Amino acid sequence: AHAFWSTQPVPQTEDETEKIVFAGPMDEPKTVADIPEEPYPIASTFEWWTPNMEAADDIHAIYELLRDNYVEDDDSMFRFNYSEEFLQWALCPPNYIPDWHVAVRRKADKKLLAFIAGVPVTLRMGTPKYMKVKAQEKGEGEEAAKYDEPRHICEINFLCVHKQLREKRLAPILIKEATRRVNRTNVWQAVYTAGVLLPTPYASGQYFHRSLNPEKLVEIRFSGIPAQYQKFQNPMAMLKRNYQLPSAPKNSGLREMKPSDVPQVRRILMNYLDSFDVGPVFSDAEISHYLLPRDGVVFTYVVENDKKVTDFFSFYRIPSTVIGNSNYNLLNAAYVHYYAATSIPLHQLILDLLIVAHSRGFDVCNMVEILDNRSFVEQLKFGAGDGHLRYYFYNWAYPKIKPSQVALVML
Ligand SMILES: CCCCCCCCCCCCCC(=O)SCCNC(=O)CCNC(=O)[C@H](O)C(C)(C)COP(=O)(O)OP(=O)(O)OC[C@H]1O[C@@H](n2cnc3c(N)ncnc32)[C@H](O)[C@@H]1OP(=O)(O)O
Ligand SMILES: COc1cccc(CC(=N)NC(=O)c2cc(Cl)ccc2OC2CCNCC2)c1
Ligand SMILES: [Mg+2]
């Protein structure tokens, strides 16, 4: 049933996943010297290409491939349109490895056919709490603790094959050549997400959405007017009213994050993320990169009412193309990114995320039920969607965890 994934170092079934009780590799690593420098074989009419994702024109080339060929909804009405500025931000964090950005080009016309990207991540990926207790109950704490220390691994995203080259087994070749480039740097695990089910997730969270401009969302067919609103004389006025928000934030001393806030934001974020089984560790440089505001890309605010940052939230922007609507070309979506609350309840913090996003022309706010995202869903009028983000590891056996024990936000 899986001609490629049955050949890879990942758990193959839920039955196998259930027997996993410690974190650790699926296959013990070889060494860099065991990995060839000759690139993986590719058809003589194609070639590997490493774009430079800090050079505007190479960013633009990958931007067009993804604009025209990256993820669509299931009814082909919307397609992600990640911006050029977002792509440079996502793929060039501190200490990134240019060789982990891998493309395929057709030699005759130089057409860009495919892309995949890795970036470094420092991840806590040791045995989860509930399995550490089971191990202690049996005298097996040492086996369960062996990989507790954060690991420097690869985060994969942006796999894309051009629509003309679909279903030709190009994706497995690109994944093998990315795996070779990562293993040549002595890294043997990766983490990745997908909205589709593959062998085999270690966690799965449902999508949630919070309408900010319901009239546009119903116009472009992201949403409908729900049945319950058809009982009113003006169903769309009632829907607008249900989703209406303040026009300015409610927390005193909310402001955009500044470079001087990086140490405090790091401290309160890392203390919060320790409560979860799987989560990133960020240096000052990585907090700077991933959370300082960037126009059109990442939005981050801190609560500092009395000269101390006590709370913060972030969100990132991905517009989607709307195929074929005469009123609108884009669906402008905000995605909940990292946050931490130490002085106010989380629903009070995230209400200001929704107010800032709506004020800035966002149409919807999206999130997965990771972190403590479930703790504000009903009061803030998020509703579950009909999709799930599944979390995977490459070459890492991991006991199944609930999505409220995941703290890695995917871009
Ligand atoms: C140590 C370092 C390790 C580094 C690498 C770690 C692993 C990283 C893994 C990648 C993480 C990516 C994270 C993201 O970016 S998730 C976003 C993925 N991108 C899209 O959905 C964009 C639109 N779709 C496409 O561009 C293509 O349909 C893709 C490229 C998805 C497949 O191209 P195509 O449709 O032309 O098919 P094929 O004939 O070439 O290949 C068929 C094989 O591909 C398997 N497939 C389908 N979808 C996915 C998917 N989302 N993750 C992994 N595998 C996937 C499929 O089960 C089949 O295998 P098997 O069922 O026969 O066994
Ligand atoms: C409606 O417009 C679209 C356009 C294209 C695709 C889709 C369906 C879809 N895949 N959603 C998501 O992935 C997603 C949904 C939510 Cl709640 C939260 C995060 C999501 O992902 C982010 C960005 C993509 N990397 C993984 C994390 C719908
Ligand atoms: Mg293919």
TrEMBL record:
InterPro entries: Acyl_CoA_acyltransferase, NMT, NMT_C, NMT_CS, NMT_N. Tetradecanoyl-CoA binds at H2, A3, F4, W5, L159, V161, R166, E167, R169, L170, A171. Residues 1-15 are annotated as: Disordered. Keywords: Acyltransferase, Metal-binding, Transferase. CoA binds at H2, F4, W5, V161, E167, R169, A171, T193. It comes from the Eukaryota. Residues 26-203 form the Glycylpeptide N-tetradecanoyltransferase N-terminal domain. GO terms for molecular function: glycylpeptide N-tetradecanoyltransferase activity; metal ion binding. The keyword Zinc-finger does not apply. One of its GO terms (biological process) is protein localization to membrane. It catalyses: N-terminal glycyl-[protein] + tetradecanoyl-CoA = N-tetradecanoylglycyl-[protein] + CoA + H(+). Mg(2+) binds at L165. It is an enzyme of class 2 (transferase). Belongs to the NMT family. Adds a myristoyl group to the N-terminal glycine residue of certain cellular proteins. This is Glycylpeptide N-tetradecanoyltransferase. The lineage of its organism: Eukaryota, Discoba, Euglenozoa, Kinetoplastea, Metakinetoplastina.
